[PDB]
Amino acid sequence: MKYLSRQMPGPSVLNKFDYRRDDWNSLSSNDKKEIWEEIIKMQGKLCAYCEKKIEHHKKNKVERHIEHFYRKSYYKNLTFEWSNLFGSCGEPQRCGFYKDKQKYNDDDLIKADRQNPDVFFHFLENGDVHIREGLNEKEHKMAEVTLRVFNLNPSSGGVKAERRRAIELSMTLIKELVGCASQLIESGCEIEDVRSMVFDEFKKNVKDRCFTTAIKHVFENRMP
């Protein structure tokens, strides 16, 4: 995951509803379309948790649904709160559809809006996740439990197969760019001059791609 930059609130039709109404099912189709328009604008076209593509370049449409960060039954005070809304894929073995059937302490969950996830996780070339060292016991507890509840670190198959395929498909660009950088440092130039330019070009070419964070992390390590 990445750090989601929440914008100024735009709930619109959500303001019309109140606590007395409750009845999440009573939301109209136009209200859902407006909410999806905002979510798409803020979130891009990728899932919040697994970063799998959720919308094609518009017959069949990818399954998607709205998720609440906190459970509705326990935290009904946030049923219509704007900060509790998220977009999730329809995969029946991970993300929202998997969070429901699990027992966990909410107070020990990572929220993409509050804290930057890059301080905990560190992906590798073959698609597995490695927890960074030097963290406190509380942080290690959160990092170790969020993957378990989200099923984002399976032994084999699942998300790991797709992450590996994406990385091996994007490996050619990384190899070429690092070759150009190595050639440019074998003649003579300022390190920050070349580094800013390569980083800018690579960042420009990786916008709106599936699993962009894994390729991101796989890029700095190879880079000198």
Partner: protein, 513 residues
């Protein structure tokens, strides 16, 4: 340092002179023969063929634990298995009874070429250091074949086994099985038959055999065996009251109770037939073997409900019925069940009957199997029974990726001196742990990517991108077709577009300095 034939001639020499069966039973020659025989390993070694079906002349060497044959249709994959079946038929027939005919070669199985006259098969069986060979032949029509067959070697092995089994009971015998394709006494005591051919997808018969065996098991757990149990229970209580509970003529009472209990229990338990192969031990041994083969389950049991009865399996925290299984699971169930049944019935003396010796032939192992099942069958087969020799033929590339390159043979067809004949080759790489398409391209030498018309535009476009040409109208319209068939976000399309950015940035930076 004890050759089998040397102890054989010593034994039969001592046996000829002495006519006392009891004395011979304790003779050290018998013990030496048994000890040396048990440590030996029964492995076939070489097979030779001549003018059989499509095959003109061939010699093949087999491994000792596993061998996989890979080829296309009509390349003699089944011919090898039928050849070995004919070779083993005569040995089995001589084992059952001396001088018994085996199975012959059908007339239509001879080669149809003009200059052919006869067809012959040769074989070699190696037992530790002892060797033997056999040759069978047949003539087309009125020609002059190689006289007659040569069974001299096989009759020595049959005589050795007959002699060993005649004096000492509950001995061991080799296992020979062949799971063919559709086509179309301890064994007699329960239900089983002595045939070399067994067919899969017969789950009904195995289901009825299992329930009938369970019924006989339960019948045997009751009756007189309960009385001995009752005595044992009293023995435990009385001795406790005399020795344990007495200490929380005590010594005399305790000694008398213990002596009487030990005497009665030993006398009753010894009286009667030995354990051997009673239905109780067969049922649980078969069930435990099946459970060991599939560790994802917890238990299997037969339940008699208020109005019906069914077999229940527990996996995780779910109870499932035997009839909810797919075709692949049923096929594996009956295959392992029959293999375990034969192994248990053939080794009544070993503590762990799964350590016997034999050879198993399987044709098209990947029938009715999901791809996720194909990637684990070999390891389980080679780990449950670790002392058996397997010969397997296959078609799927997913199975190949789990087999080491030492035990794979590839059948091809080449023409030499104007005559077309088959040849056997080996892979040029290690294909254990490679992906699906790498194994398909190397282990089988085919094309992993199809030759569809849609791929033609992709190949042409990529080639055009190589020799920088991505400005011509022809390239523009080919890009239009490609982008229409696949889409903007297809990974292949993105990878193709990546090259353009690489070149553009290359000349950009190059011109910058």
């Amino acid at each position: 340092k004890m050759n089998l034939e040397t102890c054989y001639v010593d034994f039969l020499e001592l046996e000829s002179h002495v006519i006392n069966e009891d004395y011979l039973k304790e003779s050290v020659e018998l013990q030496k023969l048994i000890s040396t025989l048990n440590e030996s390993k029964f492995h076939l070694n070489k097979i030779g063929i001549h003018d059989f079906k499509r095959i003109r002349e061939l010699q093949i060497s087999l491994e000792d634990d596993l061998t996989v044959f890979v080829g296309d249709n009509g390349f003699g994959k089944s011919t090898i298995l039928d050849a070995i079946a004919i070779v083993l038929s005569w040995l089995r027939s001589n084992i059952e009874k001396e001088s018994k005919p085996g199975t012959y070669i059908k007339s239509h199985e001879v080669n149809n070429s003009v200059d052919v006259e006869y067809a012959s098969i040769d074989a070699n069986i190696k037992l530790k250091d002892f060797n033997t060979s056999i040759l069978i032949t047949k003539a087309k029509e009125g020609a002059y074949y190689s006289r007659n067959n040569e069974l001299l070697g096989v009759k020595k092995l049959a005589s050795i086994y007959r002699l060993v089994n005649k004096y000492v009971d509950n001995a061991s015998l080799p296992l020979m099985a062949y799971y063919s394709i559709a086509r179309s006494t301890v064994w007699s005591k329960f239900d089983v038959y002595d045939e070399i051919e067994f067919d899969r997808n017969d789950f009904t018969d195995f289901f009825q055999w299992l329930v009938f065996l369970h019924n006989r098991a339960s019948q045997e757990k009751l009756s007189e065996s309960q009385t001995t149990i009752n005595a044992l229970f009293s023995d435990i209580q009385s001795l406790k009251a005399t020795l344990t509970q007495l200490s929380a003529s005590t010594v005399i009472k305790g000694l008398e109770l213990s002596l009487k209990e030990k005497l009665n229990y030993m006398k009753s338990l010894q009286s009667g037939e030995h354990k051997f192969n009673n239905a109780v031990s067969l049922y649980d041994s078969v069930i435990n073997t099946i459970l060991k083969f599939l560790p994802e389950f917890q238990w299997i049991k037969l339940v008699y409900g208020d109005d019906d009865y069914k077999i229940i399996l527990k996996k995780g925290e779910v109870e499932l019925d035997i009839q909810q299984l797919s075709q692949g699971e049923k096929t594996i169930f009956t295959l392992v069940g029959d293999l375990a049944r034969r192994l248990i019935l053939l080794n009544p003396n070993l503590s762990n009957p799964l350590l016997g010796y034999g050879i198993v032939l399987i044709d098209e192992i990947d029938l009715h199997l999901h791809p996720q099942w194909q990637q684990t069958i070999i390891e389980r087969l080679t780990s449950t029974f670790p002392n058996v020799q397997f010969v397997i033929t296959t078609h799927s590339p997913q199975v190949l990726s789990t087999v080491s390159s030492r035990s794979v043979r590839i059948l091809q067809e080449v023409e030499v001196d104007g005559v077309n004949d088959l040849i056997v080759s080996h892979p040029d790489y290690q294909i254990k742990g490679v992906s699906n398409q790498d194994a398909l391209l190397y282990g089988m030498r085919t094309d992993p990517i199809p030759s569809t018309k849609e791929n033609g535009w992709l190949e042409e476009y990529k080639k055009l991108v190589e020799l920088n040409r991505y400005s011509s109208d022809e390239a523009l319209l080919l890009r239009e077709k490609v982008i229409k068939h696949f889409g903007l976000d297809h990974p292949l399309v993105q990878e193709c577009d990546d090259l353009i950015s690489v070149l553009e940035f290359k000349n950009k930076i190059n011109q910058h300095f």
